[PDB]
Amino acid sequence: HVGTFENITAAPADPILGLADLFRADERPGKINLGIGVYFDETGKCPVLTSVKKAEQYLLENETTKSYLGIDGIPEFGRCTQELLFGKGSALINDKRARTAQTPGGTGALRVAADFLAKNTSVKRVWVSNPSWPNHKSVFNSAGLEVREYAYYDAENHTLDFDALINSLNEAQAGDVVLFHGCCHNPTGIDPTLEQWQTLAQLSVEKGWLPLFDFAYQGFARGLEEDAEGLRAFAAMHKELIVASSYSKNFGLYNERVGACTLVAADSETVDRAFSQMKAAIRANYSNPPAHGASVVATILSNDALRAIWEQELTDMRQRIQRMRQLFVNTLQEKGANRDFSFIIKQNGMFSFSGLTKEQVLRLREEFGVYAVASGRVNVAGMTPDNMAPLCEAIVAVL
Amino acid sequence: HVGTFENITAAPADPILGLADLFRADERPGKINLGIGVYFDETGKCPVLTSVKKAEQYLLENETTKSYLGIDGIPEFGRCTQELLFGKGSALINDKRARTAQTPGGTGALRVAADFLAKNTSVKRVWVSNPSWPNHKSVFNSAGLEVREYAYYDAENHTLDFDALINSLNEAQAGDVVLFHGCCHNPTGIDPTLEQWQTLAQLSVEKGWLPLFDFAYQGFARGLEEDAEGLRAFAAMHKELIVASSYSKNFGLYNERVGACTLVAADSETVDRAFSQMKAAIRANYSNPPAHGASVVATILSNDALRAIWEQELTDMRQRIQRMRQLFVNTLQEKGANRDFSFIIKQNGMFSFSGLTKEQVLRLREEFGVYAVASGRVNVAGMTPDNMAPLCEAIVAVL
Ligand SMILES: Cc1ncc(COP(=O)(O)O)c(C=O)c1O
Ligand SMILES: *Cc1c(COP(=O)(O)O)cnc(C)c1O
């Protein structure tokens, strides 16, 4: 009677999280963490938004029960989500072509979609960008879906390689899923222009793809409505699509696990039929979703006063990151870098590829106490006026 | 192109959660909800516990960040969970043989265990009592495991059929998983005696089963420690086991999704190796767990003054249910029932198997507005002094 657990092989280190335990252990003073994807403020802290604290006080005074939510969560949460993604007065909403389930984070939204697709459709293949968020492949593989990669980044020009993106998707067939980042591509910060989004929307229709949008950073590129232009171009042309969205970053609600999976089909009758199977996939996973984070979002979005506070806090975050992008480039020059880092200014969101090699990312860590993901992705929101000069001196030393 | 969603078949209703939907829509003022397993107080409400409101007020004023938890959640939540399960000073704890992940509810803990087994071991079959919670089968089937049923309930004598149980399980092979309810069996309310638990533990070892304990009602049968006696007899003999526990009910934190998956192995090296893969399965599901409800639990169990308040609140819930069981049986005789219902006094927890047929349950709903599960399972914790007479009048009218 051998043990069931004896033949188990240890799992490797998570590329984004295996770094953060290694940082908490580093006993050297002045270590700098440019790793995980949370926003920091000017003091190097990840604070709770004021609008979130106000909403939580209201919930504390007014909640009378913790009784289970429905499988698909708080109804007002789904309605507010659809307005954010598609626009108030969107035809998708008036025609009742969309259904939204509240999920545990954006990751939970991707997993719910994966399980739904694997069990209820003939989907076998998901196409994701090279590079992408590393957990994309793990989520879809957990449902038994093959993940293929399409070309995306021109590492010479630090730009979108649009010709190669098109050519690399030539073999994506009708009924394959193609995954797009809605804005603030993770990790490159390079997003399609509006004309490129429109080109992709037309191509997607002709080839019969099922688009799946991962929308974790709405509001961090240009603004809430501007950042959804690409999704709304797809939505104007497609009968069917899926949107996995996250409120982890734009509400600073990371650890409360607040996301949404939104299904769109040709008509009300079809999406309700499909959504009933998505609810069955949720029930066999975590049963029903956590209330606290989504109650906060629904409260803020339903209250004109709180929503005005939140939108300003989101603008404040967006502008800080842009300020840091400029300061990073200026300070690298001041500290003597001869490589041109000006592409950094053109990139959107929290993350840019620095262009550093795994070998330089390792030298920064072991020699200077500066922590970046081994792909060379650095979190610009982890940079402050206080840590920018040491950080830049370190990069310049390993160049 | 024909749509990917066009030919999806609609999912059937959940036998528990679909009932709740019907109950909401029912416009009759006298309707009575004996379906879903939530606790109601003497006034028919599902309250937030006082210990929980106090912990939530502490969190509101002292939380400074919502930054992601680690994949396995709050460390103190895991330590407190193991103490509750195995007891302060257990050798599993001092030998470092146990690892706990915070999960989204007991359901999420079940799905995480199932995914982990399916993807990292040779396990193929899970054995589940007949009857059991209806969602057990969906969770294990959705992870790719086969579900087999073992005998349990003697429907004529309203008792545990221990000879049938043991002969059923002689077909379970070594390396199969056998699922046990820790206490307050759902739906029958009939649990093994300590002497039967000890018989099963010895037998489990001889045959090479991997025990999986589902522990959603610790404290609702006799007490916190007494309700863990059967699990602790297993933990005394086995090299390996899995416990999926829930805080939904004994903390009234249903909609915050608070549970734990606890892995036990032969030694520290093996459990950490196994746990590394469990973390991978979580990362590919919901990434990391929701903080609010687990933080409430850990605040309460970590503070003797809050813990004392909570323990009294749990005792009060347990005693109120015991008072309704007696009131239920006495009132049925007063209302003209000629059958003996005294077996309800011998059942533990929220649920009693009433012995009503599907046709009688349907008639209770349609004609009297009394909602029970089609199996005839009734939630005693939904009974109150005020609704007892009409409820019993309805049941007598359909006998
Ligand atoms: C036996 C059993 N297992 C699991 C669960 C699920 O617990 P949770 O709501 O925390 O997911 C329940 C509660 O409904 C239960 O009765
Ligand atoms: C961070 C991130 C997620 C995960 O969002 P959570 O809400 O934390 O689960 C998903 N997709 C992308 C592209 C991300 O950057």
mmCIF file of all heavy atoms in Angstrom, chain A residues 1 4 6 8-9 46 53 56 63 65-66 111 240 255-257 273 276 283 288 291, chain B residues 4 6 8 11 14 46 53 56 60 63 65-66 115 206 240 255-257 273 277 288:
data_model
loop_
_atom_site.group_PDB
_atom_site.id
_atom_site.type_symbol
_atom_site.label_atom_id
_atom_site.label_comp_id
_atom_site.label_asym_id
_atom_site.label_seq_id
_atom_site.Cartn_x
_atom_site.Cartn_y
_atom_site.Cartn_z
ATOM 1 N N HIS A 1 0.825 -1.204 0.000
ATOM 2 C CA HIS A 1 0.000 0.000 0.000
ATOM 3 C C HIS A 1 0.862 1.258 0.000
ATOM 4 O O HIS A 1 1.056 1.895 1.038
ATOM 5 C CB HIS A 1 -0.939 0.011 1.209
ATOM 6 C CG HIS A 1 -2.103 -0.918 1.077
ATOM 7 N ND1 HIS A 1 -2.359 -1.633 -0.074
ATOM 8 C CD2 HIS A 1 -3.082 -1.252 1.952
ATOM 9 C CE1 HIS A 1 -3.444 -2.367 0.098
ATOM 10 N NE2 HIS A 1 -3.902 -2.154 1.318
ATOM 11 N N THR A 4 -0.324 7.579 -1.840
ATOM 12 C CA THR A 4 -0.832 8.226 -3.041
ATOM 13 C C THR A 4 -0.023 9.460 -3.419
ATOM 14 O O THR A 4 -0.015 9.839 -4.595
ATOM 15 C CB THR A 4 -2.308 8.581 -2.827
ATOM 16 O OG1 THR A 4 -3.097 7.381 -2.872
ATOM 17 C CG2 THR A 4 -2.807 9.559 -3.874
ATOM 18 N N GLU A 6 3.358 9.912 -3.054
ATOM 19 C CA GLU A 6 4.801 9.705 -3.122
ATOM 20 C C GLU A 6 5.360 9.979 -4.511
ATOM 21 O O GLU A 6 6.501 10.439 -4.632
ATOM 22 C CB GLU A 6 5.156 8.280 -2.691
ATOM 23 C CG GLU A 6 5.001 8.018 -1.194
ATOM 24 C CD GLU A 6 5.852 8.944 -0.336
ATOM 25 O OE1 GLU A 6 6.889 9.435 -0.834
ATOM 26 O OE2 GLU A 6 5.477 9.186 0.832
ATOM 27 N N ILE A 8 4.378 12.264 -6.537
ATOM 28 C CA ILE A 8 4.105 13.633 -6.954
ATOM 29 C C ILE A 8 5.406 14.370 -7.238
ATOM 30 O O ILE A 8 6.369 14.296 -6.463
ATOM 31 C CB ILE A 8 3.282 14.372 -5.884
ATOM 32 C CG1 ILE A 8 1.854 13.831 -5.876
ATOM 33 C CG2 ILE A 8 3.314 15.873 -6.144
ATOM 34 C CD1 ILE A 8 0.983 14.359 -4.766
ATOM 35 N N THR A 9 5.434 15.110 -8.336
ATOM 36 C CA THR A 9 6.572 15.942 -8.697
ATOM 37 C C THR A 9 6.330 17.363 -8.206
ATOM 38 O O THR A 9 5.245 17.914 -8.413
ATOM 39 C CB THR A 9 6.789 15.945 -10.209
ATOM 40 O OG1 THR A 9 7.115 14.622 -10.648
ATOM 41 C CG2 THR A 9 7.905 16.889 -10.587
ATOM 42 N N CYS A 46 0.822 50.340 -0.816
ATOM 43 C CA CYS A 46 -0.348 49.978 -1.610
ATOM 44 C C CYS A 46 -1.589 50.264 -0.775
ATOM 45 O O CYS A 46 -2.030 49.408 0.007
ATOM 46 C CB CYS A 46 -0.292 48.505 -2.022
ATOM 47 S SG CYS A 46 -1.720 47.949 -2.997
ATOM 48 N N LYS A 53 -12.983 52.724 1.361
ATOM 49 C CA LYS A 53 -13.236 52.809 2.798
ATOM 50 C C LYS A 53 -14.640 53.339 3.076
ATOM 51 O O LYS A 53 -15.345 52.826 3.953
ATOM 52 C CB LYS A 53 -12.199 53.695 3.489
ATOM 53 C CG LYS A 53 -10.855 53.029 3.738
ATOM 54 C CD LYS A 53 -10.938 51.905 4.762
ATOM 55 C CE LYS A 53 -9.541 51.526 5.231
ATOM 56 N NZ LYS A 53 -9.525 50.336 6.120
ATOM 57 N N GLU A 56 -17.080 50.598 2.432
ATOM 58 C CA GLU A 56 -17.041 49.561 3.460
ATOM 59 C C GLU A 56 -17.730 50.021 4.742
ATOM 60 O O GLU A 56 -18.422 49.232 5.395
ATOM 61 C CB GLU A 56 -15.595 49.139 3.738
ATOM 62 C CG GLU A 56 -14.986 48.266 2.639
ATOM 63 C CD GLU A 56 -13.571 47.784 2.956
ATOM 64 O OE1 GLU A 56 -12.719 48.619 3.329
ATOM 65 O OE2 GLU A 56 -13.311 46.567 2.823
ATOM 66 N N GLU A 63 -25.459 46.155 6.171
ATOM 67 C CA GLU A 63 -25.660 44.731 5.930
ATOM 68 C C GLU A 63 -26.418 44.097 7.090
ATOM 69 O O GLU A 63 -26.033 44.246 8.254
ATOM 70 C CB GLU A 63 -24.334 43.999 5.761
ATOM 71 C CG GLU A 63 -23.673 44.168 4.438
ATOM 72 C CD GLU A 63 -22.440 43.292 4.309
ATOM 73 O OE1 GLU A 63 -21.985 42.718 5.326
ATOM 74 O OE2 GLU A 63 -21.935 43.174 3.179
ATOM 75 N N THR A 65 -27.423 40.631 6.671
ATOM 76 C CA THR A 65 -27.279 39.191 6.496
ATOM 77 C C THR A 65 -26.056 38.897 5.636
ATOM 78 O O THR A 65 -25.624 39.733 4.840
ATOM 79 C CB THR A 65 -28.541 38.594 5.858
ATOM 80 O OG1 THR A 65 -28.471 37.164 5.886
ATOM 81 C CG2 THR A 65 -28.681 39.049 4.407
ATOM 82 N N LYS A 66 -25.493 37.698 5.824
ATOM 83 C CA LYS A 66 -24.454 37.160 4.954
ATOM 84 C C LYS A 66 -24.960 35.978 4.136
ATOM 85 O O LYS A 66 -24.160 35.174 3.643
ATOM 86 C CB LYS A 66 -23.237 36.715 5.761
ATOM 87 C CG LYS A 66 -22.604 37.775 6.613
ATOM 88 C CD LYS A 66 -21.888 38.780 5.766
ATOM 89 C CE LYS A 66 -20.879 39.568 6.588
ATOM 90 N NZ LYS A 66 -20.245 40.590 5.712
ATOM 91 N N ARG A 111 -11.031 31.292 -15.735
ATOM 92 C CA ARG A 111 -11.226 29.877 -15.449
ATOM 93 C C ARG A 111 -12.672 29.458 -15.681
ATOM 94 O O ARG A 111 -12.928 28.392 -16.253
ATOM 95 C CB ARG A 111 -10.793 29.590 -14.013
ATOM 96 C CG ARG A 111 -11.159 28.222 -13.507
ATOM 97 C CD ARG A 111 -10.520 27.075 -14.322
ATOM 98 N NE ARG A 111 -10.866 25.830 -13.647
ATOM 99 C CZ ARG A 111 -10.073 25.174 -12.807
ATOM 100 N NH1 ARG A 111 -8.838 25.597 -12.563
ATOM 101 N NH2 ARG A 111 -10.526 24.079 -12.217
ATOM 102 N N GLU A 240 -20.919 36.834 -31.028
ATOM 103 C CA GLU A 240 -20.523 36.095 -29.840
ATOM 104 C C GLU A 240 -19.168 36.596 -29.375
ATOM 105 O O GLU A 240 -18.258 36.781 -30.189
ATOM 106 C CB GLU A 240 -20.447 34.588 -30.125
ATOM 107 C CG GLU A 240 -21.784 33.941 -30.488
ATOM 108 C CD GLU A 240 -21.634 32.474 -30.854
ATOM 109 O OE1 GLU A 240 -20.521 32.089 -31.263
ATOM 110 O OE2 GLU A 240 -22.616 31.705 -30.732
ATOM 111 N N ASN A 255 -7.081 41.727 -3.052
ATOM 112 C CA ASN A 255 -7.268 40.521 -2.256
ATOM 113 C C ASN A 255 -8.729 40.210 -1.951
ATOM 114 O O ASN A 255 -8.998 39.197 -1.299
ATOM 115 C CB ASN A 255 -6.449 40.594 -0.956
ATOM 116 C CG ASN A 255 -6.994 41.582 0.065
ATOM 117 O OD1 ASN A 255 -8.089 42.128 -0.066
ATOM 118 N ND2 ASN A 255 -6.207 41.808 1.111
ATOM 119 N N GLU A 256 -9.681 41.010 -2.423
ATOM 120 C CA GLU A 256 -11.089 40.663 -2.251
ATOM 121 C C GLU A 256 -11.665 39.878 -3.434
ATOM 122 O O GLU A 256 -12.790 39.374 -3.335
ATOM 123 C CB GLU A 256 -11.911 41.932 -2.010
ATOM 124 C CG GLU A 256 -11.424 42.787 -0.834
ATOM 125 C CD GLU A 256 -11.675 42.167 0.542
ATOM 126 O OE1 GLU A 256 -12.000 40.963 0.629
ATOM 127 O OE2 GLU A 256 -11.543 42.903 1.547
ATOM 128 N N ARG A 257 -10.922 39.760 -4.536
ATOM 129 C CA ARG A 257 -11.244 38.872 -5.657
ATOM 130 C C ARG A 257 -12.576 39.257 -6.310
ATOM 131 O O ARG A 257 -13.599 38.582 -6.184
ATOM 132 C CB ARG A 257 -11.253 37.408 -5.197
ATOM 133 C CG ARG A 257 -10.105 37.021 -4.248
ATOM 134 C CD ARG A 257 -8.691 37.319 -4.817
ATOM 135 N NE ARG A 257 -8.479 36.717 -6.135
ATOM 136 C CZ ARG A 257 -8.080 37.366 -7.233
ATOM 137 N NH1 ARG A 257 -7.796 38.666 -7.217
ATOM 138 N NH2 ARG A 257 -7.939 36.686 -8.361
ATOM 139 N N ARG A 273 -29.620 30.482 -22.536
ATOM 140 C CA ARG A 273 -29.320 29.057 -22.592
ATOM 141 C C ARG A 273 -27.854 28.802 -22.255
ATOM 142 O O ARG A 273 -27.540 27.964 -21.401
ATOM 143 C CB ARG A 273 -29.672 28.525 -23.981
ATOM 144 C CG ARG A 273 -30.280 27.141 -24.006
ATOM 145 C CD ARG A 273 -30.930 26.840 -25.371
ATOM 146 N NE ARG A 273 -29.963 26.892 -26.467
ATOM 147 C CZ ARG A 273 -29.992 27.771 -27.468
ATOM 148 N NH1 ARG A 273 -30.951 28.681 -27.545
ATOM 149 N NH2 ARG A 273 -29.057 27.732 -28.407
ATOM 150 N N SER A 276 -26.900 29.473 -18.552
ATOM 151 C CA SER A 276 -27.304 28.442 -17.602
ATOM 152 C C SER A 276 -26.214 27.386 -17.444
ATOM 153 O O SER A 276 -26.027 26.855 -16.344
ATOM 154 C CB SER A 276 -28.626 27.794 -18.028
ATOM 155 O OG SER A 276 -28.443 26.799 -19.019
ATOM 156 N N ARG A 283 -21.063 26.487 -10.139
ATOM 157 C CA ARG A 283 -21.580 25.773 -8.978
ATOM 158 C C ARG A 283 -20.667 24.619 -8.589
ATOM 159 O O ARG A 283 -20.486 24.341 -7.397
ATOM 160 C CB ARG A 283 -22.999 25.301 -9.291
ATOM 161 C CG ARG A 283 -23.594 24.312 -8.331
ATOM 162 C CD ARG A 283 -23.797 24.909 -6.952
ATOM 163 N NE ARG A 283 -24.858 24.197 -6.248
ATOM 164 C CZ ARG A 283 -25.044 24.208 -4.932
ATOM 165 N NH1 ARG A 283 -24.230 24.892 -4.137
ATOM 166 N NH2 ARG A 283 -26.052 23.523 -4.411
ATOM 167 N N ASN A 288 -20.697 29.845 -5.281
ATOM 168 C CA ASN A 288 -21.172 31.206 -5.481
ATOM 169 C C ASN A 288 -20.097 32.161 -4.989
ATOM 170 O O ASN A 288 -19.203 31.755 -4.235
ATOM 171 C CB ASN A 288 -22.507 31.451 -4.757
ATOM 172 C CG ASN A 288 -22.531 30.860 -3.364
ATOM 173 O OD1 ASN A 288 -21.984 31.437 -2.430
ATOM 174 N ND2 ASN A 288 -23.166 29.701 -3.219
ATOM 175 N N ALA A 291 -18.984 38.120 -1.502
ATOM 176 C CA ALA A 291 -19.828 39.307 -1.563
ATOM 177 C C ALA A 291 -19.059 40.614 -1.364
ATOM 178 O O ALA A 291 -19.362 41.608 -2.032
ATOM 179 C CB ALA A 291 -20.939 39.205 -0.510
ATOM 180 N N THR B 4 -20.644 29.420 -32.036
ATOM 181 C CA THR B 4 -20.151 28.460 -31.054
ATOM 182 C C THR B 4 -21.186 28.159 -29.969
ATOM 183 O O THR B 4 -21.219 27.035 -29.454
ATOM 184 C CB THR B 4 -18.853 28.991 -30.441
ATOM 185 O OG1 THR B 4 -17.888 29.197 -31.482
ATOM 186 C CG2 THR B 4 -18.286 28.016 -29.432
ATOM 187 N N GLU B 6 -24.550 28.283 -30.344
ATOM 188 C CA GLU B 6 -25.885 28.083 -30.898
ATOM 189 C C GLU B 6 -26.526 26.784 -30.418
ATOM 190 O O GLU B 6 -27.741 26.738 -30.190
ATOM 191 C CB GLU B 6 -25.805 28.115 -32.426
ATOM 192 C CG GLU B 6 -27.094 28.513 -33.117
ATOM 193 C CD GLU B 6 -26.887 28.910 -34.574
ATOM 194 O OE1 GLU B 6 -25.807 29.445 -34.905
ATOM 195 O OE2 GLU B 6 -27.809 28.686 -35.388
ATOM 196 N N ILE B 8 -25.759 24.899 -27.641
ATOM 197 C CA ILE B 8 -25.683 24.542 -26.235
ATOM 198 C C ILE B 8 -27.064 24.162 -25.727
ATOM 199 O O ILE B 8 -28.079 24.782 -26.075
ATOM 200 C CB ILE B 8 -25.074 25.694 -25.420
ATOM 201 C CG1 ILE B 8 -23.626 25.902 -25.865
ATOM 202 C CG2 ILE B 8 -25.167 25.383 -23.935
ATOM 203 C CD1 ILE B 8 -22.947 27.100 -25.246
ATOM 204 N N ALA B 11 -28.927 23.987 -19.010
ATOM 205 C CA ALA B 11 -28.649 23.182 -17.833
ATOM 206 C C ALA B 11 -29.916 23.023 -16.999
ATOM 207 O O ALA B 11 -30.737 23.946 -16.936
ATOM 208 C CB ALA B 11 -27.545 23.820 -16.993
ATOM 209 N N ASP B 14 -30.471 23.658 -10.338
ATOM 210 C CA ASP B 14 -29.834 23.082 -9.164
ATOM 211 C C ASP B 14 -30.917 22.684 -8.165
ATOM 212 O O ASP B 14 -31.790 23.503 -7.847
ATOM 213 C CB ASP B 14 -28.856 24.084 -8.561
ATOM 214 C CG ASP B 14 -28.008 23.477 -7.467
ATOM 215 O OD1 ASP B 14 -28.492 23.380 -6.318
ATOM 216 O OD2 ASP B 14 -26.862 23.079 -7.761
ATOM 217 N N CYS B 46 -31.905 35.637 8.934
ATOM 218 C CA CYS B 46 -30.563 35.061 8.903
ATOM 219 C C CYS B 46 -29.553 36.137 9.301
ATOM 220 O O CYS B 46 -29.052 36.865 8.439
ATOM 221 C CB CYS B 46 -30.246 34.508 7.512
ATOM 222 S SG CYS B 46 -28.627 33.711 7.386
ATOM 223 N N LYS B 53 -19.689 41.108 13.327
ATOM 224 C CA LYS B 53 -19.795 42.560 13.207
ATOM 225 C C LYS B 53 -18.651 43.263 13.933
ATOM 226 O O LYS B 53 -18.098 44.249 13.428
ATOM 227 C CB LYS B 53 -21.142 43.042 13.751
ATOM 228 C CG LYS B 53 -22.323 42.853 12.810
ATOM 229 C CD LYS B 53 -22.231 43.731 11.568
ATOM 230 C CE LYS B 53 -23.554 43.718 10.816
ATOM 231 N NZ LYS B 53 -23.557 44.541 9.573
ATOM 232 N N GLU B 56 -15.473 42.761 11.930
ATOM 233 C CA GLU B 56 -15.522 43.591 10.729
ATOM 234 C C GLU B 56 -15.259 45.060 11.055
ATOM 235 O O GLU B 56 -14.656 45.785 10.257
ATOM 236 C CB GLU B 56 -16.875 43.438 10.028
ATOM 237 C CG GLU B 56 -17.033 42.149 9.222
ATOM 238 C CD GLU B 56 -18.327 42.103 8.410
ATOM 239 O OE1 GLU B 56 -19.414 42.396 8.957
ATOM 240 O OE2 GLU B 56 -18.250 41.772 7.210
ATOM 241 N N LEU B 60 -12.263 47.330 9.405
ATOM 242 C CA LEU B 60 -12.485 48.609 8.744
ATOM 243 C C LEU B 60 -11.516 49.669 9.251
ATOM 244 O O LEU B 60 -10.957 50.439 8.461
ATOM 245 C CB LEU B 60 -13.930 49.058 8.952
ATOM 246 C CG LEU B 60 -14.237 50.443 8.383
ATOM 247 C CD1 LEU B 60 -14.041 50.426 6.868
ATOM 248 C CD2 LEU B 60 -15.634 50.902 8.757
ATOM 249 N N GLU B 63 -7.307 47.953 8.677
ATOM 250 C CA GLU B 63 -6.757 47.544 7.394
ATOM 251 C C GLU B 63 -6.122 48.723 6.674
ATOM 252 O O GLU B 63 -6.772 49.750 6.458
ATOM 253 C CB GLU B 63 -7.851 46.966 6.502
ATOM 254 C CG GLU B 63 -8.088 45.498 6.658
ATOM 255 C CD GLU B 63 -8.998 44.959 5.575
ATOM 256 O OE1 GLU B 63 -9.491 45.760 4.748
ATOM 257 O OE2 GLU B 63 -9.217 43.731 5.552
ATOM 258 N N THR B 65 -4.128 47.930 3.629
ATOM 259 C CA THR B 65 -3.893 47.538 2.245
ATOM 260 C C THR B 65 -4.833 46.400 1.884
ATOM 261 O O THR B 65 -5.332 45.675 2.751
ATOM 262 C CB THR B 65 -2.431 47.117 2.005
ATOM 263 O OG1 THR B 65 -2.179 46.952 0.600
ATOM 264 C CG2 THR B 65 -2.134 45.812 2.722
ATOM 265 N N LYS B 66 -5.095 46.272 0.582
ATOM 266 C CA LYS B 66 -5.808 45.126 0.034
ATOM 267 C C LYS B 66 -4.904 44.317 -0.887
ATOM 268 O O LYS B 66 -5.399 43.585 -1.750
ATOM 269 C CB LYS B 66 -7.056 45.560 -0.734
ATOM 270 C CG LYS B 66 -8.020 46.421 0.041
ATOM 271 C CD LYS B 66 -8.897 45.579 0.916
ATOM 272 C CE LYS B 66 -10.083 46.365 1.437
ATOM 273 N NZ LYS B 66 -10.851 45.492 2.371
ATOM 274 N N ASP B 115 -9.260 18.814 -8.246
ATOM 275 C CA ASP B 115 -8.308 19.181 -9.290
ATOM 276 C C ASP B 115 -6.916 18.647 -8.964
ATOM 277 O O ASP B 115 -6.243 18.062 -9.819
ATOM 278 C CB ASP B 115 -8.263 20.703 -9.462
ATOM 279 C CG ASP B 115 -9.441 21.243 -10.256
ATOM 280 O OD1 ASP B 115 -10.154 20.455 -10.906
ATOM 281 O OD2 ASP B 115 -9.659 22.469 -10.225
ATOM 282 N N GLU B 206 -6.344 -0.737 6.382
ATOM 283 C CA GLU B 206 -6.144 -2.062 5.807
ATOM 284 C C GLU B 206 -6.326 -2.056 4.294
ATOM 285 O O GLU B 206 -5.563 -2.702 3.567
ATOM 286 C CB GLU B 206 -7.118 -3.060 6.438
ATOM 287 C CG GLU B 206 -6.788 -3.475 7.859
ATOM 288 C CD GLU B 206 -7.884 -4.329 8.482
ATOM 289 O OE1 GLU B 206 -7.860 -5.562 8.283
ATOM 290 O OE2 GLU B 206 -8.775 -3.767 9.158
ATOM 291 N N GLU B 240 -1.885 9.607 5.130
ATOM 292 C CA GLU B 240 -2.379 10.620 4.206
ATOM 293 C C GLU B 240 -3.876 10.835 4.381
ATOM 294 O O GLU B 240 -4.631 9.875 4.559
ATOM 295 C CB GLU B 240 -2.100 10.206 2.747
ATOM 296 C CG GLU B 240 -0.653 9.836 2.470
ATOM 297 C CD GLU B 240 -0.410 9.438 1.027
ATOM 298 O OE1 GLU B 240 -1.313 8.832 0.410
ATOM 299 O OE2 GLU B 240 0.686 9.737 0.508
ATOM 300 N N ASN B 255 -21.838 34.076 2.373
ATOM 301 C CA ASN B 255 -21.573 34.731 1.098
ATOM 302 C C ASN B 255 -20.179 35.354 1.009
ATOM 303 O O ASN B 255 -19.837 35.904 -0.041
ATOM 304 C CB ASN B 255 -22.671 35.773 0.768
ATOM 305 C CG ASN B 255 -22.640 37.026 1.647
ATOM 306 O OD1 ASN B 255 -21.754 37.224 2.471
ATOM 307 N ND2 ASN B 255 -23.634 37.888 1.450
ATOM 308 N N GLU B 256 -19.346 35.229 2.046
ATOM 309 C CA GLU B 256 -17.958 35.677 1.963
ATOM 310 C C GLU B 256 -17.003 34.557 1.550
ATOM 311 O O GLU B 256 -15.819 34.827 1.320
ATOM 312 C CB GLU B 256 -17.510 36.283 3.301
ATOM 313 C CG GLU B 256 -18.421 37.413 3.818
ATOM 314 C CD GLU B 256 -18.312 38.707 3.011
ATOM 315 O OE1 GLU B 256 -17.756 38.665 1.891
ATOM 316 O OE2 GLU B 256 -18.781 39.764 3.498
ATOM 317 N N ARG B 257 -17.497 33.319 1.448
ATOM 318 C CA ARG B 257 -16.762 32.188 0.886
ATOM 319 C C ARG B 257 -15.481 31.899 1.662
ATOM 320 O O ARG B 257 -14.378 32.217 1.205
ATOM 321 C CB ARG B 257 -16.473 32.450 -0.598
ATOM 322 C CG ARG B 257 -17.684 32.971 -1.418
ATOM 323 C CD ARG B 257 -18.979 32.140 -1.248
ATOM 324 N NE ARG B 257 -18.829 30.747 -1.674
ATOM 325 C CZ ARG B 257 -19.075 29.679 -0.912
ATOM 326 N NH1 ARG B 257 -19.514 29.808 0.338
ATOM 327 N NH2 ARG B 257 -18.888 28.464 -1.410
ATOM 328 N N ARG B 273 6.013 18.981 -0.805
ATOM 329 C CA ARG B 273 6.040 18.625 -2.219
ATOM 330 C C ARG B 273 4.627 18.527 -2.784
ATOM 331 O O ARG B 273 4.333 19.076 -3.853
ATOM 332 C CB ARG B 273 6.798 17.307 -2.391
ATOM 333 C CG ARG B 273 7.431 17.113 -3.753
ATOM 334 C CD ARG B 273 8.392 15.907 -3.771
ATOM 335 N NE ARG B 273 7.675 14.651 -3.972
ATOM 336 C CZ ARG B 273 7.622 13.647 -3.097
ATOM 337 N NH1 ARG B 273 8.270 13.708 -1.939
ATOM 338 N NH2 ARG B 273 6.922 12.564 -3.401
ATOM 339 N N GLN B 277 2.056 21.482 -5.560
ATOM 340 C CA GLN B 277 1.156 21.256 -6.682
ATOM 341 C C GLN B 277 -0.256 21.731 -6.377
ATOM 342 O O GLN B 277 -0.942 22.227 -7.276
ATOM 343 C CB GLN B 277 1.158 19.776 -7.061
ATOM 344 C CG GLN B 277 2.430 19.354 -7.775
ATOM 345 C CD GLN B 277 2.501 19.868 -9.198
ATOM 346 O OE1 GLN B 277 1.738 20.749 -9.601
ATOM 347 N NE2 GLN B 277 3.422 19.316 -9.971
ATOM 348 N N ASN B 288 -5.709 33.488 -5.982
ATOM 349 C CA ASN B 288 -5.520 33.641 -4.547
ATOM 350 C C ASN B 288 -6.868 33.979 -3.922
ATOM 351 O O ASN B 288 -7.779 34.442 -4.623
ATOM 352 C CB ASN B 288 -4.468 34.718 -4.234
ATOM 353 C CG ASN B 288 -4.655 35.967 -5.054
ATOM 354 O OD1 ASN B 288 -5.443 36.839 -4.702
ATOM 355 N ND2 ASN B 288 -3.925 36.066 -6.157
#
